Design a protein around this ligand. Sequence first.
Ligand SMILES: CO[C@H]1/C=C/O[C@@]2(C)Oc3c(C)c(O)c4c(O)c(c(/C=N/N5CCN(C6CCCC6)CC5)c(O)c4c3C2=O)NC(=O)/C(C)=C\C=C\[C@H](C)[C@H](O)[C@@H](C)[C@@H](O)[C@@H](C)[C@H](OC(C)=O)[C@@H]1C
Ligand SMILES: [Mg+2]
Ligand SMILES: [Mg+2]
Ligand SMILES: [Mg+2]
Ligand SMILES: [Mg+2]
Ligand SMILES: [Mg+2]
Ligand SMILES: [Mg+2]
Ligand SMILES: [Mg+2]
Ligand SMILES: [Mg+2]
Ligand SMILES: [Mg+2]
Ligand SMILES: [Mg+2]
Ligand SMILES: [Mg+2]
Ligand SMILES: [Mg+2]
Ligand SMILES: [Mg+2]
Ligand SMILES: [Mg+2]
Ligand SMILES: [Mg+2]
Ligand SMILES: [Mg+2]
Ligand SMILES: [Mg+2]
Ligand SMILES: [Mg+2]
Ligand SMILES: [Mg+2]
Ligand SMILES: [Mg+2]
Ligand SMILES: [Mg+2]
Ligand SMILES: [Mg+2]
Ligand SMILES: [Mg+2]
Ligand SMILES: [Mg+2]
Ligand SMILES: [Mg+2]
Ligand SMILES: [Mg+2]
Ligand SMILES: [Mg+2]
Ligand SMILES: [Mg+2]
Ligand SMILES: [Mg+2]
Ligand SMILES: [Mg+2]
Ligand SMILES: [Mg+2]
Ligand SMILES: [Mg+2]
Ligand SMILES: [Mg+2]
Ligand SMILES: [Mg+2]
Ligand SMILES: [Mg+2]
Ligand SMILES: [Mg+2]
Ligand SMILES: [Mg+2]
Ligand SMILES: [Mg+2]
Ligand SMILES: [Mg+2]
Ligand SMILES: [Mg+2]
Ligand SMILES: [Mg+2]
Ligand SMILES: [Mg+2]
Ligand SMILES: [Mg+2]
Ligand SMILES: [Mg+2]
Ligand SMILES: [Mg+2]
Ligand SMILES: [Mg+2]
Ligand SMILES: [Mg+2]
Ligand SMILES: [Mg+2]
Ligand SMILES: [Mg+2]
Ligand SMILES: [Mg+2]
Ligand SMILES: [Mg+2]
Ligand SMILES: [Mg+2]
Ligand SMILES: [Mg+2]
Ligand SMILES: [Mg+2]
Ligand SMILES: [Mg+2]
Ligand SMILES: [Mg+2]
Ligand SMILES: [Mg+2]
Ligand SMILES: [Mg+2]
Ligand SMILES: [Mg+2]
Ligand SMILES: [Mg+2]
Ligand SMILES: [Mg+2]
Ligand SMILES: [Mg+2]
Ligand SMILES: [Mg+2]
Ligand SMILES: [Mg+2]
Ligand SMILES: [Mg+2]
Ligand SMILES: [Mg+2]
Ligand SMILES: [Mg+2]
Ligand SMILES: [Mg+2]
Ligand SMILES: [Mg+2]
Ligand SMILES: [Mg+2]
Ligand SMILES: [Mg+2]
Ligand SMILES: [Mg+2]
Ligand SMILES: [Mg+2]
Ligand SMILES: [Mg+2]
Ligand SMILES: [Mg+2]
Ligand SMILES: [Mg+2]
Ligand SMILES: [Mg+2]
Ligand SMILES: [Mg+2]
Ligand SMILES: [Mg+2]
Ligand SMILES: [Mg+2]
Ligand SMILES: [Mg+2]
Ligand SMILES: [Mg+2]
Ligand SMILES: [Mg+2]
Ligand SMILES: [Mg+2]
Ligand SMILES: [Mg+2]
Ligand SMILES: [Mg+2]
Ligand SMILES: [Mg+2]
Ligand SMILES: [Mg+2]
Ligand SMILES: [Mg+2]
Ligand SMILES: [Mg+2]
Ligand SMILES: [Mg+2]
Ligand SMILES: [Mg+2]
Ligand SMILES: [Mg+2]
Ligand SMILES: [Mg+2]
Ligand SMILES: [Mg+2]
Ligand SMILES: [Mg+2]
Ligand SMILES: [Mg+2]
Ligand SMILES: [Mg+2]
Ligand SMILES: [Mg+2]
Ligand SMILES: [Mg+2]
Ligand SMILES: [Mg+2]
Ligand SMILES: [Mg+2]
Ligand SMILES: [Mg+2]
Ligand SMILES: [Mg+2]
Ligand SMILES: [Mg+2]
Ligand SMILES: [Mg+2]
Ligand SMILES: [Mg+2]
Ligand SMILES: [Mg+2]
Ligand SMILES: [Mg+2]
Ligand SMILES: [Mg+2]
Ligand SMILES: [Mg+2]
Ligand SMILES: [Mg+2]
Ligand SMILES: [Mg+2]
Ligand SMILES: [Mg+2]
Ligand SMILES: [Mg+2]
Ligand SMILES: [Mg+2]
Ligand SMILES: [Mg+2]
Ligand SMILES: [Mg+2]
Ligand SMILES: [Mg+2]
Ligand SMILES: [Mg+2]
Ligand SMILES: [Mg+2]
Ligand SMILES: [Mg+2]
Ligand SMILES: [Mg+2]
Ligand SMILES: [Mg+2]
Ligand SMILES: [Mg+2]
Ligand SMILES: [Mg+2]
Ligand SMILES: [Mg+2]
Ligand SMILES: [Mg+2]
Ligand SMILES: [Mg+2]
Ligand SMILES: [Mg+2]
Ligand SMILES: [Mg+2]
Ligand SMILES: [Mg+2]
Ligand SMILES: [Zn+2]
Lengths: 340, 243, 229, 229, 95, 621, 37
Amino acid sequence: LSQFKDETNPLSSLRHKRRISALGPGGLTRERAGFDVRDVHRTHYGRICPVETPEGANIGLITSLAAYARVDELGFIRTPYRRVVGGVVTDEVVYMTATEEDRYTIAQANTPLEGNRIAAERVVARRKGEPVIVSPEEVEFMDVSPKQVFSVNTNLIPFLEHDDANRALMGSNMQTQAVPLIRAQAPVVMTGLEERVVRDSLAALYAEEDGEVAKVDGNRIVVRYEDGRLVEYPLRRFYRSNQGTALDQRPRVVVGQRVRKGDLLADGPASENGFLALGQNVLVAIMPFDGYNFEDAIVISEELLKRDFYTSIHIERYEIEARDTKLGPERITRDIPHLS
Amino acid sequence: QKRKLQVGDKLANRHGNKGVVAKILPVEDMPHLPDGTPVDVILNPLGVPSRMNLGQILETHLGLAGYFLGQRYISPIFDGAKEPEIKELLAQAFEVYFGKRKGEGFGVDKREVEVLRRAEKLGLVTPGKTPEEQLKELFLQGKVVLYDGRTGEPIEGPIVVGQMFIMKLYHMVEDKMHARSTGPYSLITQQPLGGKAQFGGQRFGEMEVWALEAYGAAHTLQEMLTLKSDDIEGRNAAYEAII
Amino acid sequence: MLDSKLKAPVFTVRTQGREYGEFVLEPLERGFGVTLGNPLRRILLSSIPGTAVTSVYIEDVLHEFSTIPGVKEDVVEIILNLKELVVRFLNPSLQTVTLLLKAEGPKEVKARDFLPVADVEIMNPDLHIATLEEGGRLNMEVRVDRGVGYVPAEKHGIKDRINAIPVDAVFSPVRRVAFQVEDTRLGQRTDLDKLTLRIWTDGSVTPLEALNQAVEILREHLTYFSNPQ
Amino acid sequence: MLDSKLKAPVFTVRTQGREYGEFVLEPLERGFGVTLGNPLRRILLSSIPGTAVTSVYIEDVLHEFSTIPGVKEDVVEIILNLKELVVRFLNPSLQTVTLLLKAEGPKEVKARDFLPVADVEIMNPDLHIATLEEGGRLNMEVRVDRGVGYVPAEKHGIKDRINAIPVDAVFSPVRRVAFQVEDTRLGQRTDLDKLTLRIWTDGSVTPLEALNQAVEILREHLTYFSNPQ
Amino acid sequence: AEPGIDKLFGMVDSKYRLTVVVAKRAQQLLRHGFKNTVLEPEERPKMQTLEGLFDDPNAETWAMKELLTGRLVFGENLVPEDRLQKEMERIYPGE
Amino acid sequence: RVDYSGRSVIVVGPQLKLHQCGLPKRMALELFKPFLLKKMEEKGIAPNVKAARRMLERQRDIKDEVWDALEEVIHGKVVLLNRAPTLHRLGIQAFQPVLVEGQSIQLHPLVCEAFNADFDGDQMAVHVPLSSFAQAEARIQMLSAHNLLSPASGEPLAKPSRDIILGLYYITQVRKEKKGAGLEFATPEEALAAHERGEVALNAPIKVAGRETSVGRLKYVFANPDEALLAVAHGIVDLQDVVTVRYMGKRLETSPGRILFARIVAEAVEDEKVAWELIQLDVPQEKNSLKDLVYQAFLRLGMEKTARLLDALKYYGFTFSTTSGITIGIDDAVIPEEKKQYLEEADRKLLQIEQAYEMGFLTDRERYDQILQLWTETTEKVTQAVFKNFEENYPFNPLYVMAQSGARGNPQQIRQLCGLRGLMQKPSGETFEVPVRSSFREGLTVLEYFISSHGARKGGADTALRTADSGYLTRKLVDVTHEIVVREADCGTTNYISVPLFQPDEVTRSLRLRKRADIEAGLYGRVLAREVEVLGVRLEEGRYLSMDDVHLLIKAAEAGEIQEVPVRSPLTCQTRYGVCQKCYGYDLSMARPVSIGEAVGIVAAQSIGEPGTQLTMRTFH
Amino acid sequence: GRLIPAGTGSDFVRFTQVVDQKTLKAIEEARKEAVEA
Ligand SMILES: CO[C@H]1/C=C/O[C@@]2(C)Oc3c(C)c(O)c4c(O)c(c(/C=N/N5CCN(C6CCCC6)CC5)c(O)c4c3C2=O)NC(=O)/C(C)=C\C=C\[C@H](C)[C@H](O)[C@@H](C)[C@@H](O)[C@@H](C)[C@H](OC(C)=O)[C@@H]1C
Ligand SMILES: [Mg+2]
Ligand SMILES: [Mg+2]
Ligand SMILES: [Mg+2]
Ligand SMILES: [Mg+2]
Ligand SMILES: [Mg+2]
Ligand SMILES: [Mg+2]
Ligand SMILES: [Mg+2]
Ligand SMILES: [Mg+2]
Ligand SMILES: [Mg+2]
Ligand SMILES: [Mg+2]
Ligand SMILES: [Mg+2]
Ligand SMILES: [Mg+2]
Ligand SMILES: [Mg+2]
Ligand SMILES: [Mg+2]
Ligand SMILES: [Mg+2]
Ligand SMILES: [Mg+2]
Ligand SMILES: [Mg+2]
Ligand SMILES: [Mg+2]
Ligand SMILES: [Mg+2]
Ligand SMILES: [Mg+2]
Ligand SMILES: [Mg+2]
Ligand SMILES: [Mg+2]
Ligand SMILES: [Mg+2]
Ligand SMILES: [Mg+2]
Ligand SMILES: [Mg+2]
Ligand SMILES: [Mg+2]
Ligand SMILES: [Mg+2]
Ligand SMILES: [Mg+2]
Ligand SMILES: [Mg+2]
Ligand SMILES: [Mg+2]
Ligand SMILES: [Mg+2]
Ligand SMILES: [Mg+2]
Ligand SMILES: [Mg+2]
Ligand SMILES: [Mg+2]
Ligand SMILES: [Mg+2]
Ligand SMILES: [Mg+2]
Ligand SMILES: [Mg+2]
Ligand SMILES: [Mg+2]
Ligand SMILES: [Mg+2]
Ligand SMILES: [Mg+2]
Ligand SMILES: [Mg+2]
Ligand SMILES: [Mg+2]
Ligand SMILES: [Mg+2]
Ligand SMILES: [Mg+2]
Ligand SMILES: [Mg+2]
Ligand SMILES: [Mg+2]
Ligand SMILES: [Mg+2]
Ligand SMILES: [Mg+2]
Ligand SMILES: [Mg+2]
Ligand SMILES: [Mg+2]
Ligand SMILES: [Mg+2]
Ligand SMILES: [Mg+2]
Ligand SMILES: [Mg+2]
Ligand SMILES: [Mg+2]
Ligand SMILES: [Mg+2]
Ligand SMILES: [Mg+2]
Ligand SMILES: [Mg+2]
Ligand SMILES: [Mg+2]
Ligand SMILES: [Mg+2]
Ligand SMILES: [Mg+2]
Ligand SMILES: [Mg+2]
Ligand SMILES: [Mg+2]
Ligand SMILES: [Mg+2]
Ligand SMILES: [Mg+2]
Ligand SMILES: [Mg+2]
Ligand SMILES: [Mg+2]
Ligand SMILES: [Mg+2]
Ligand SMILES: [Mg+2]
Ligand SMILES: [Mg+2]
Ligand SMILES: [Mg+2]
Ligand SMILES: [Mg+2]
Ligand SMILES: [Mg+2]
Ligand SMILES: [Mg+2]
Ligand SMILES: [Mg+2]
Ligand SMILES: [Mg+2]
Ligand SMILES: [Mg+2]
Ligand SMILES: [Mg+2]
Ligand SMILES: [Mg+2]
Ligand SMILES: [Mg+2]
Ligand SMILES: [Mg+2]
Ligand SMILES: [Mg+2]
Ligand SMILES: [Mg+2]
Ligand SMILES: [Mg+2]
Ligand SMILES: [Mg+2]
Ligand SMILES: [Mg+2]
Ligand SMILES: [Mg+2]
Ligand SMILES: [Mg+2]
Ligand SMILES: [Mg+2]
Ligand SMILES: [Mg+2]
Ligand SMILES: [Mg+2]
Ligand SMILES: [Mg+2]
Ligand SMILES: [Mg+2]
Ligand SMILES: [Mg+2]
Ligand SMILES: [Mg+2]
Ligand SMILES: [Mg+2]
Ligand SMILES: [Mg+2]
Ligand SMILES: [Mg+2]
Ligand SMILES: [Mg+2]
Ligand SMILES: [Mg+2]
Ligand SMILES: [Mg+2]
Ligand SMILES: [Mg+2]
Ligand SMILES: [Mg+2]
Ligand SMILES: [Mg+2]
Ligand SMILES: [Mg+2]
Ligand SMILES: [Mg+2]
Ligand SMILES: [Mg+2]
Ligand SMILES: [Mg+2]
Ligand SMILES: [Mg+2]
Ligand SMILES: [Mg+2]
Ligand SMILES: [Mg+2]
Ligand SMILES: [Mg+2]
Ligand SMILES: [Mg+2]
Ligand SMILES: [Mg+2]
Ligand SMILES: [Mg+2]
Ligand SMILES: [Mg+2]
Ligand SMILES: [Mg+2]
Ligand SMILES: [Mg+2]
Ligand SMILES: [Mg+2]
Ligand SMILES: [Mg+2]
Ligand SMILES: [Mg+2]
Ligand SMILES: [Mg+2]
Ligand SMILES: [Mg+2]
Ligand SMILES: [Mg+2]
Ligand SMILES: [Mg+2]
Ligand SMILES: [Mg+2]
Ligand SMILES: [Mg+2]
Ligand SMILES: [Mg+2]
Ligand SMILES: [Mg+2]
Ligand SMILES: [Mg+2]
Ligand SMILES: [Mg+2]
Ligand SMILES: [Mg+2]
Ligand SMILES: [Mg+2]
Ligand SMILES: [Zn+2]
């Protein structure tokens, strides 16, 4: 169960810290049983993504939860659903157990809303795993969000709406394989959680309380809070990620600067401006070329390398030991016995 | 070590379009827009119908707007941007694109008009309207005219283009293309084994055997079973002979 | 001359600075603006020579992935900023010029801070090299060369000082090319090509100069069709 | 010379007759075979001006869709056969030459049947114009001009005689152009452009000649970049 | 594809026979000396760093280039097994 | 583990010809190490082996003279490439290496279909034929460009895949634009003139529905072949435009592109007329028309000559594809105007079914099964609707031609984008009562999505299960079938089977002609057991029936002259361990008879194990 | 690890020799030599 950290970039690791697996103790679901478990059960709503699981032999048995999914008292993924008394929708939320969710008539967030007022007579809801066109008078509870339906990792996709759930999985696992480029860039079009991802993951360093900046080294940003205190914030210059991706904190604040509480002092391995950034927005034409892009091939403009655009720093840690043989200790010396 | 992009590398957007670099073109001749700015990457269309993620084609369209309009946007999961709102920003972008073009001193190409002709015969532009007006329509559709770059002629029929985010994927140890001539051998099993510096041989599985069996590859299979992996006295005399 | 030859490409130019240069030329027969604009473009980008930072030596730094105290930026960010630097020497005699710069303490290091050299000029003075805090000691020697195209730091491997680190070569002085062929009406017939190409340049050379070099490369190539075999 | 200049475009040629002519030229730097082949092609087809039947006047015929008695072929089939006719005049003084031909009865009308003109020659004598039966009266005047490229009969609308009918303009001794850019390996670096272009010609001029003319038109055009304004 | 592969296929009773011929001919071409060929003079085997293929690049590319002509003879039992290798060593030098 | 092996990532090699493949020199070096060593000694680069060895033990020490040595060692040798699941014999193919820089392995596009290899990280291994024999076979009977037709079906496997068709198709399609005023030129001369001027005006298009000739044909007439394209070059006629042209002896009314395609082939193989006899320029080139072209060319002209046509098609397809400017766009997926209708109409009808239940008429179940029927119909309704849309209004819709052309696209797929994906099933299998009203063009909602997701998993779970079942099967078959090998003299036992051309029960009893497929399957390249005189021709005994013959017998059964066919077969052979020439038939990967010594046992066991991966997998029994 | 029964390893072709008309006359000369005294 305890695994190597998945730091190919903050996102990847973070997710690897919120995964739910089948296999394990050997006593619980092992290798044999499957198809009934492996399928996306009805209750999996807001509690488990239906796109997240690993496209491979071990599919559906390993998956990260959803956006607003929270383990209450005993391991029962509850999902936030807001209350709607009569034709009135509330800003109050109930984290409901899987079981209780069935006793009610629940509706989707897409329902035209005037505030507390539901707007259409024949508006969708789903009793118990069954799609049902219910009246505004039967709508007991409503979905809290579209985000809560999926995982964080997935929530980062632009128009998820127009993409086949099948390939959307690919897109979600692809992010998990994102390598940090010395030049980060946030999407020209984002969903809305890039900010929250970097923040909740521990990529960028944020300011505790308001104050001014004292020194802005390449290795430290000693900020001065208005409370009459100042603290030195080291920046993991160049560190070795478990999978060999660079993790450097590049200061974004100049000398002597009044900082707002919780503002990026330095950017995470992959952040541009407090926003998640991987790869780099690039102008792209979408046509066929000779054969260079034939089944799934990509043609790239030399220009992309002229500017240090897709470039990334690696680090492999070679290691050797001086062992004690009964034939004589293995000395480690500049002496290389035979030729130059 | 600095890992600059190269042909062997694999990049993929957030939608799922995954793929490898097959050729790095000289800015000299890749697809270029009317104003001298050229495209960085050219994605194959074909990979989009089969797979079903139009979201990427939707991104590229908002992207085009964000390019000329110099702005980034935030399109929520299912609540986000709508087709009319994007056509709206594309409209705003046409003015930055073509508006400056009007003032900077010039109008439309022989090429620009030519592709318009083939475009109306297609059904992308309302026949009878002025090129200026026609191009707006065409732009709002997300595609613009592109010239070859190698020939300078246009690419018959508007092509879409835009700001698509694309990541580069980590290279596994396997990526390190293995390749072994001769090397160690297991102690009990006399078959090739690698490890630290010698690459370790590839596996010839039954499925592969049959593949050769089907063919009249008699010796070639023998070799795979003898000279190449287990024939102790075989491989040795094998090398020497080759030598 | 008066009729067909006086009716000749009115070569007109509009150039501000050494970066931008528009060039109009009309009238031209049928589909020639294209016939000319395209080759020149292909040349203007691939063919023309320039300048770029080819090597760097920070005095206390040994590898490229290091960080200098009192210096916010990291070696790799700085060597990057140097690639941004555009210099211009005036004659062949200068093939490889080493520019030197040393600044200490609470000062911002811009490109104007490099000690002037006789035949060389820095068009990129205000470019930002680094931000030095206190006790910030940065003493470097940045090589500069005249070449053509792109040459990966790996390809050349420059060796001024053993602890120095090579940088990628961005030798095209041309930034972008662009050409438009709009119709022009000359008396009799309307079908006419008007070629105007817009050239941008890092400063090393000028739009005009580039253009001239270009056309020559083409000319020189058109002569290579001399001896049959 | 020995190093970079001796390493020069080996211009090699292979020509059989006056119609086909292959032309190889290597080595070339990066993406130049294209840079050269493409323009030359555009010139070879549009520029190498030539000749083509621009108008026709059958004496009893009024429209192009008519049929002449005793004449198997229809007006449209014949005007088509005329597009196949290749003539060659020797000097500028001949801009528009009207060739005349009248033949009667049981004879086959070939291009040699046209009354000879002083400065004009017909390279296409045996070409087949028509098959006349009996009481077959065909008297026509086929105009001929010197121009460039393709001009639809609609575009010019020639008017010698009011009952005459214009024909499409196939202005070129060049039939087709073709160029290939295959890699060639020269010692050190592999990336190399090898430009070989294949030219076909109706016989009027030769592949080589055409090519030469072509390059010149380009050269001449590269000179038009002289006087700024 | 390869030169007259059809023409070759056609000269044999079985596909897999053609393959054995070519291979055995390639064998002898090298063993007894590589000049053991039947078609060297005017238009022959050639490679381009020089026109040097005339000496020893690909064995069978020759074998096939000869078999495509009608000089060689492949039988089930054409010439007695051991006397063949003797007569061949006697007449072809180069070692 | 093989001793002379390698493995790297693959990448498309568009210029590469079927014949060869791009192999990283860096790899070639280790691979052909010993072959190089000696070659070093034969040249000045090194004194001896041990020397030549140390000479290369470090990367920085290699003189550029070594590459020249290796490149010389590899002159005519070839290697094998493998793919992840080796499912059939073509799962390993031989090619000539053309050494290249870097890490990736350049693979040809046409063979990306034999090996199921796409380029999203697929890695292929590579082996080396050491004996002069292993090499002989390897390049003679194992090289790619020699095994063009599959062992499963006499259908080609070297067909213009995705990008090639798309190219080749766009070039040959004709257009139709606006019908307003009269379309009658067949008869009046005032019709030629008026609709010629009317077309010059803004009313009549160049491609109007006007039987005999749309004014686009009236305006332009092209004497010689070339003349046609030159006009195209100059911007007179697009390639997809309907024009008239004079060919060898006919005034043919065909488009530029079509005429051009004609040449491509006519050129690939210089027997110009033979190029015309096996081509259909009467239609847009789909993968099928192409597929056919290939086959025909194979029997007609000969193997290698075909190879040429293959690359020729590959080349032009690729090029023309780039210029066509076909792209994916959001507005290109077009939603029909009828969708709203069909939806609402079926919407209200749902209301009736509800009023019918609120009353007590239909049982709990009746309601359900009636609703599903509503949608299942309505959904199929939008599907033919969207197509009709494109078919009539946008013939050249991006997303369209790809599907039409043998290129890329599935009717069901298109429906999900432009029309709508309508019914997803519950966890168990009972389909849901409510459909998925949306398309991918517009926001597939929050839940209609969650709904469609279920069925996705079952598909994936199924796929993962055949990555081994695909082998499950093949194992069994090869365990029983390996021994089977063609070793013979025409087996003298003439006990034969009769192939039925007619089936008794679709509709209880009605005799009907079997599908062209099955029949092709039954009699292709078989050996007639007894003589049959059918439409006028005397098929002799023992003759191997070509696909052209099997096309005669069907035309004959259509007429009503034969209900069965006498033919040798494996089910009736006498050779205990083995099968004979006359009883196997034709299909080697080559189209002539089978060649003695072919491992049929496995060739068979394979052709059956692969497709299996496509079959459903709920429960074995 | 024996040669495959099927394929080029066919009893029908495992044995097949090749000749040059030069080596054809060379072996018949060997037969001529068989004539004693
Ligand atoms: C508890 O440590 C081990 C227990 C083994 O025993 C055994 C029997 O019990 C297991 C569990 C209880 C698991 O929960 C489990 C996983 O969750 C899992 C994979 C396997 N994932 N691989 C499969 C191959 N592909 C590849 C891509 C190209 C094709 C091949 C990548 C994903 C897996 O096999 C699992 C597994 C077992 O096999 N993964 C994913 O969910 C996933 C989709 C992606 C995550 C990727 C990270 C990069 C990865 O996490 C990494 C940081 C390491 O942590 C692991 C390697 C770890 O090894 C060590 C050492 O630490 C083992 C999990
Ligand atoms: Mg069990
Ligand atoms: Mg048990
Ligand atoms: Mg799923
Ligand atoms: Mg698996
Ligand atoms: Mg399993
Ligand atoms: Mg608990
Ligand atoms: Mg719900
Ligand atoms: Mg309202
Ligand atoms: Mg109630
Ligand atoms: Mg994202
Ligand atoms: Mg930036
Ligand atoms: Mg915000
Ligand atoms: Mg303090
Ligand atoms: Mg403190
Ligand atoms: Mg620190
Ligand atoms: Mg460290
Ligand atoms: Mg201060
Ligand atoms: Mg502030
Ligand atoms: Mg730069
Ligand atoms: Mg950069
Ligand atoms: Mg590398
Ligand atoms: Mg910009
Ligand atoms: Mg930009
Ligand atoms: Mg801009
Ligand atoms: Mg607007
Ligand atoms: Mg306007
Ligand atoms: Mg990995
Ligand atoms: Mg070893
Ligand atoms: Mg191991
Ligand atoms: Mg290692
Ligand atoms: Mg090794
Ligand atoms: Mg020995
Ligand atoms: Mg005048
Ligand atoms: Mg002015
Ligand atoms: Mg000015
Ligand atoms: Mg002029
Ligand atoms: Mg001119
Ligand atoms: Mg003009
Ligand atoms: Mg450039
Ligand atoms: Mg150059
Ligand atoms: Mg200079
Ligand atoms: Mg110092
Ligand atoms: Mg001076
Ligand atoms: Mg001076
Ligand atoms: Mg001077
Ligand atoms: Mg000089
Ligand atoms: Mg000087
Ligand atoms: Mg100096
Ligand atoms: Mg100093
Ligand atoms: Mg200075
Ligand atoms: Mg001074
Ligand atoms: Mg001086
Ligand atoms: Mg400023
Ligand atoms: Mg200090
Ligand atoms: Mg150098
Ligand atoms: Mg170097
Ligand atoms: Mg040194
Ligand atoms: Mg650089
Ligand atoms: Mg520079
Ligand atoms: Mg540029
Ligand atoms: Mg010169
Ligand atoms: Mg000269
Ligand atoms: Mg010669
Ligand atoms: Mg040169
Ligand atoms: Mg010759
Ligand atoms: Mg002559
Ligand atoms: Mg008549
Ligand atoms: Mg008469
Ligand atoms: Mg007539
Ligand atoms: Mg006629
Ligand atoms: Mg007629
Ligand atoms: Mg005469
Ligand atoms: Mg002519
Ligand atoms: Mg080639
Ligand atoms: Mg050649
Ligand atoms: Mg040199
Ligand atoms: Mg040199
Ligand atoms: Mg030629
Ligand atoms: Mg002139
Ligand atoms: Mg010879
Ligand atoms: Mg022979
Ligand atoms: Mg015997
Ligand atoms: Mg001897
Ligand atoms: Mg290649
Ligand atoms: Mg190398
Ligand atoms: Mg080695
Ligand atoms: Mg040495
Ligand atoms: Mg050298
Ligand atoms: Mg791949
Ligand atoms: Mg991957
Ligand atoms: Mg593999
Ligand atoms: Mg009407
Ligand atoms: Mg009608
Ligand atoms: Mg009609
Ligand atoms: Mg008619
Ligand atoms: Mg009729
Ligand atoms: Mg018409
Ligand atoms: Mg019709
Ligand atoms: Mg007729
Ligand atoms: Mg036919
Ligand atoms: Mg036909
Ligand atoms: Mg048709
Ligand atoms: Mg049609
Ligand atoms: Mg091309
Ligand atoms: Mg409408
Ligand atoms: Mg109704
Ligand atoms: Mg029910
Ligand atoms: Mg219909
Ligand atoms: Mg319709
Ligand atoms: Mg239609
Ligand atoms: Mg369309
Ligand atoms: Mg709706
Ligand atoms: Mg929506
Ligand atoms: Mg038998
Ligand atoms: Mg019977
Ligand atoms: Mg029957
Ligand atoms: Mg029926
Ligand atoms: Mg019945
Ligand atoms: Mg019946
Ligand atoms: Mg049927
Ligand atoms: Mg009988
Ligand atoms: Mg009988
Ligand atoms: Mg009968
Ligand atoms: Mg008969
Ligand atoms: Mg017979
Ligand atoms: Mg038959
Ligand atoms: Mg028949
Ligand atoms: Mg009949
Ligand atoms: Mg078969
Ligand atoms: Mg077979
Ligand atoms: Mg089971
Ligand atoms: Mg033997
Ligand atoms: Zn039998």
